[PDB]
Symmetry: C3
Subunit: 283 residues, 3 copies
């Protein structure tokens, strides 16, 4: 880890000196989901370029801005754009903002992503509650907690079996009928894979049979640092495409599709997240 | 990646300046598969060490020579010997030649390799058509496309589910009867594993039940960057050993047995590659 | 890509060799909270890792950072009290460095010990599981200590691992167990190495279970691999210190404090088991 505690704290203090907003909740917007910053009231925007030690969003459509505001009674900071391992960033860079959020006094993180559907019962545009994850990069060494541990942040060995807040999940489930949607809110396991290339049929069949329900190349490392420093974590994927499972499909996965599915799902995601805010425990 | 796009152009311009051959098809030769250059007419030979940015071949069975010539009419360039991640090479060094072949004007890549049989039916000396792969190092971050993307080669997010040209595979299947062989032509999934040490029984069983028919430590990275820059890929393995699947056996994998079987099959490979050449479509 | 030369391993070996009178046949690597294994050695000689010219540091709790020479029960031993893990951010060629030094010491048998979370339903906390096989997940994807130029003088370019865990010793541990006097049986199974440092999620543990692995830890495999590289005989066992969380309704979680304490509970059992094992090891 090429960042000291002192690195995080300078970023954290820079923000505190540059905004009057004091966020309780941080929200990471995945591909094509940048539009959840739309309903924030009294919003103050920062380009990542502006912020000391911030990596940049290079993939479309990640805008690369940090937005402060109020959403449904809640003091929020939003990541309009995130970072990925496949852009060549070490995981301690990809997850850098999460520690700076904690230093700001954020106690809850919500992580959003576009994800390819593995489970046959998912249609495109489905929202899936992330119940759990499978961390393939982590299994083999790629874990943002590798190296010296700083107990000011958390333990040498934090458990991950309760990563996704059980209570918020139950709340979002029963909350769902207020969305008034003709489709049920999905629950499932997210599997992280590094990319940047999409998956083969063979690879999909393994993922599906590992028990994963959706696949993407993000999010998991953010969760892992978030939990390490004790934040409540809530996550959901938007199912942008169904991964190709047969060898006779002339169909192929593409980012264009995944950004398009993120646009169709704007108003539904806006509303879902809005509602969600109200269900977050006070400090 | 440590290579600028210009670094590739230099190697390409250099090759173009030192041979009048204009390859259409590129061919990468696996361990003990170097004999495939034998049938090139008007062959022109290069030591890898002559070619400005080329890595070296350190594994026995890999001659370290690049040869331009005509294979049964078709203008080819062959990698007599390849590179592996386990030699200490990053994947951007490993697959560097593919990128240069693309700039050479190569439109087709044939990847060859020796593999251990995971599928119970397969025998030593069988040729398996690679239909699809499972990229295990790719799952956890070891993918040659990691880092900034150069649009001059491909897209940030290329699909892989159509990696191994269907038509070429089907044609190879029709045409196998010309070989006058008593075994059939096999078709299956290659799983890439990084080694350099051979698999345990237990690892072999996970690989078997993941849906893999053959195992080795090469090829997939090459294929990923071939496809990323639009080349049509064809791939096959020579099954050189049956990987150990139980604890009572006193047999263990060794590279020497791998090169021994490469030598036994030299005539059939040459005869198969020949074809294969006749049916590669013109530019 | 290994930072160490043959000369480097050799300086360390010769340094130990002049600083001790001991000539160990056997090396034992103690896992988390298995350090208590050093206590039964006779005519002991302790070296801090920081004294030995090329050794790395042990950072994690339950790992003392010591090399101890002595006789276990007439058997000449060297024990690593503490070990190194990849998650501390060490290259695997630092993690495994002492294994090649033990080889140059004249050690021909290596015994690796670890604490592990049980994946197998039938394992109980406090069980000893003989390791028969492993699944090397960082290996699958590149993280293998042998990556890079091969040192010919230690071993082959592509060494086999299917025979890694000496069959005869395991059988002797099996038929000899009646000596231990436990109304629990000696377990046997496959160790799956995961990198860590965080513990596994439920779904992770489910994949690991269906991969056929019986016990999960974050160490051991790299040491085993380079042991066999230089042709040491290898024996492996896990202490099952916790049952891995396998369902969403549970309020329990894996924690390192529970791991360290199960080791302290099991010490007399391990002590006893390790000594009978030393009767099993073949003479040079
Ligand atoms: O099918 C998919 N396979 C893998 N990932 C994925 C995603 C998420 N997007 C990726 C980042 O994690 C990447 O930006 C390509 O869309 C959407 N759809 C898929
Ligand atoms: O059994 C095998 N397990 C793994 N790889 C493999 C190969 C291919 N050869 C390897 C590199 O890919 C390596 O050179 C050892 O043969 C032939 N046979 C096997
Ligand atoms: O449940 C576990 N999951 C992973 N590892 C593990 C161990 C072994 N200890 C680990 C290092 O290998 C780590 O020190 C935390 O205990 C004991 N119990 C477990």
């Amino acid at each position: 880890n090429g960042y000291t505690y002192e690195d995080y704290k300078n970023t954290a203090e820079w923000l505190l000196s540059h905004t009057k907003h004091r966020p309780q909740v941080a929200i990471i917007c995945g591909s094509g989901l940048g539009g959840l910053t739309d309903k924030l009231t009294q919003a103050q925007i920062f380009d990542y370029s502006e912020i000391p030690n911030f990596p940049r969003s290079t993939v479309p459509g990640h805008a690369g801005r940090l937005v402060f505001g109020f959403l449904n009674g809640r003091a929020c900071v939003m990541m309009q754009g995130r970072f990925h391992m496949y852009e060549g960033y070490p995981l301690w860079k990809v997850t850098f903002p999460v520690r700076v959020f904690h230093l700001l006094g954020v106690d809850t993180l919500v992580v959003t992503n576009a994800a390819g559907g593995l489970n046959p019962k998912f249609e495109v545009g489905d929202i899936m509650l992330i119940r759990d994850h499978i961390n393939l990069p982590g299994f083999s060494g790629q874990n943002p907690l590798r190296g010296p541990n700083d107990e000011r942040f958390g333990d040498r060995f934090p458990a991950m079996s309760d990563a996704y807040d059980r209570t918020m999940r139950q709340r979002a489930l029963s909350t769902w009928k207020q969305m008034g949607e003709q489709r049920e809110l999905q629950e499932g396991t997210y599997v992280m894979v590094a990319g940047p290339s999409f998956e083969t049929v063979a690879e999909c069949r393994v993922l599906q049979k590992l028990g994963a329900d959706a696949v993407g190349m993000s999010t998991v490392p953010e969760v892992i640092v978030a939990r390490h420093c004790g934040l409540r974590v809530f996550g959901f994927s938007l199912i942008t495409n169904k991964v190709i499972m047969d060898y006779e499909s002339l169909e192929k996965a593409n980012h264009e599709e995944v950004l398009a599915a993120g646009k169709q799902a704007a108003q539904k995601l806006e509303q879902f997240v809005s509602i969600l805010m109200a269900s977050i425990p006070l400090p």
